[PDB]
């Protein structure tokens, strides 16, 4: 169960459900929801939460 | 009532303070906060709220 996605933009949470992203954070994406929020594990911070879909790219 | 910004990505609110964006929505940007959330008026919908700063680009006109 390794990285599915990589953060490409800085995201600072405003809401308690959100996942903080730094550029190049490795992400394990558990759910790509119909409202364009991704539920993920940040593999750098160990935090879980949601972020806006366009903040990450799919990795090989 | 002049547009400052344009939505470039679909943004569906999860929170009541958030602004729904469709791609190309004209935006009047009222506040660019230190945490990279923008407060805007959506000029298509008439809604107000906040969205993640990378979801919009500045229009130079």
Numbering used by the authors:
A (entry chain BBB): 489 to 548
B (entry chain AAA): 489 to 549
Quote the authors verbatim:
NMR studies in the 1970s demonstrated that aromatic side chains can undergo ring flips—that is, 180° rotations of the χ2 dihedral angle (Cβ–Cγ axis)—even when engaged in stabilizing interactions in the hydrophobic core. Here we capture ring flipping events of a buried tyrosine residue in the SH3 domain of the JNK-interacting protein 1 (JIP1). Our data therefore suggest that the conformation of the aromatic ring at position 526 is determined by steric interactions dictated by the size of the surrounding amino acids.
Accordingly, we designed four different mutants of JIP1-SH3 (H493A, V517A, V517L and A541L) and obtained their high-resolution structures by X-ray crystallography. The high resolution of these structures, ranging from 1.4 to 1.9 Å, allows unambiguous determination of the conformation of Y526 and the surrounding residues, as demonstrated by their unbiased electron density maps.
